[PDB]
Amino acid sequence: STGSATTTPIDSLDDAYITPVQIGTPAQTLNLDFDTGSSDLWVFSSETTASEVDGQTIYTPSKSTTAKLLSGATWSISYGDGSSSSGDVYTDTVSVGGLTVTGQAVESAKKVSSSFTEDSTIDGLLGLAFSTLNTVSPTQQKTFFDNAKASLDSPVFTADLGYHAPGTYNFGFIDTTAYTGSITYTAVSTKQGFWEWTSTGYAVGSGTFKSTSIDGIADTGTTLLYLPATVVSAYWAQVSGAKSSSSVGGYVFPCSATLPSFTFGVGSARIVIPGDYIDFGPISTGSSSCFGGIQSSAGIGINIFGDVALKAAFVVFNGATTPTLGFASK
């Protein structure tokens, strides 16, 4: 089997991407944030505290003939951005782009933090990291990908995120028309539950490539590119007037600037992030100070190849017995 679904930016900055997901019988379609940095499929629901729901589409398990309470199971998650949610668990039928899993754990939110309430466009998350990170207790549950894997034509999914445009998540096949050149594969460590890999280095603009190992995670659920302070300083030093602002919470730059590209290494291959991808616009409405898309990972504890990086590539998440990651230009 295979599946193919379009993923769409939630706003003009590509702050996140939503993908329609069918849950239950008859189908209830919710727009979920596919997140390769976590492993819970959770949704706004009829059980979510009413004051914490503001425009989201909810899953109502009592209206699904295939929903079953997973008795005794609860979940609770905190994300790197400080947001969180928790609740109980149903199993139900879940389909993504034509690919159907029966018995998928659908984690129903009883509580969500303010960041989720305030984002009307995201109805929940669909985790695509390794199932070892799933928070369901006392019986840990499998991700959608893990459940689908055995049935897929090939045990893979691909992320093809657009810049200011829709893109595609495919399950079970590699669309050879969706990228240019060849795909370069690189080793993955699953020890922390993430798609963790080591970039071979970087360049700023037309500058020479610096060969250096950068361990980090491929994370579709993080907006920006978070890298070591040394690398980030070298990037922003090439933008007149750019500075790190403790008050704003990162590097900012004059909105009048033209940003250089940023290149990262995948083995001997190179992925080029155009300068425009690194512009996240005014820090506040009407400001001439713009927020940068490359930020320091210092104090996160891990480097994160988020959407800024991933959207410059066609990315293969290979869930074979020994997982690997593939990157191609597009």
- If asked whether residues 188 and 262 sit together in one domain, one would say yes
Interatomic CA distance for residues 308 and 263, integer angstroms: 12
- If asked whether residues 113 and 257 sit together in one domain, one would say no
Angle at 302 between CA 298 and CA 303, to 5 degrees: 85
- Calculate the alpha carbon distances from 111 to 8, 33, 134 in Å: 26, 18, 18
Residues 6+ apart with CB under 8 A from 325: 185, 186, 188, 195, 197, 218, 315, 316, 317, 318
- If asked whether residues 139 and 74 sit together in one domain, one would say yes
Which of residues 151, 174, 197 is at a domain's end? Answer: 174
What is the secondary structure of 206-254 as a DSSP string?
A: TSPPEEEEEEEEE-TT--SEEE-HHHHHHHHTTSTT-EEETTTTEEEEE
Q: What is the CATH number of the domain that holds 304?
A: 2.40.70.10
- If asked whether residues 62 and 131 sit together in one domain, one would say yes
Tokens 């996240």 correspond to what residue? 280
Beta bridge partners of 94: 23, 101
**Catalytic residue check, 35:** yes
Which of residues 110, 139, 174 is at a domain's end? Answer: 174
- Calculate the alpha carbon distances from 224 to 69, 116, 176, 181, 245 in Å: 37, 18, 27, 26, 17
Which of residues 174, 202, 222 is at a domain's end? Answer: 174
Q: Which of 14, 35, 40, 160 is catalytic?
A: 35
Interatomic CA distance for residues 304 and 306, integer angstroms: 6
**Annotated resolution, angstroms:** 1.3
Beta bridge partners of 168: 6, 160
Angle at 142 between CA 138 and CA 148, to 5 degrees: 160
Q: Which of 199, 261, 296, 297 is catalytic?
A: 199
- If asked whether residues 97 and 199 sit together in one domain, one would say no
- Calculate the alpha carbon distances from 309 to 44, 72, 226, 263 in Å: 29, 40, 10, 9
- If asked whether residues 167 and 181 sit together in one domain, one would say no
Number of domains in the chain: 2
* Residues of the domain holding 140: 5-174
Tokens 């690189």 correspond to what residue? 186
- If asked whether residues 151 and 216 sit together in one domain, one would say no
- If asked whether residues 127 and 245 sit together in one domain, one would say no
- If asked whether residues 156 and 74 sit together in one domain, one would say yes
CB 44 within 8 A of CB 124: yes
**Catalytic residue check, 215:** no
- If asked whether residues 157 and 43 sit together in one domain, one would say yes
- If asked whether residues 79 and 184 sit together in one domain, one would say no
How many CB atoms are located within 10 Å of the residue 301 CB? 7
Written as one letter, the residue type at 269 is A
- If asked whether residues 51 and 11 sit together in one domain, one would say yes
Q: For the chain, how many residues are written?
A: 330
Phi, psi of 132 (to 5 degrees): -60, -20
Angle at 94 between CA 91 and CA 98, to 5 degrees: 160
CB 16 within 8 A of CB 223: yes
What is the secondary structure of 8-51 as a DSSP string?
A: EESSTT---EEEEEEETTTTEEEEEEEETT---EEE-BTTS-GG
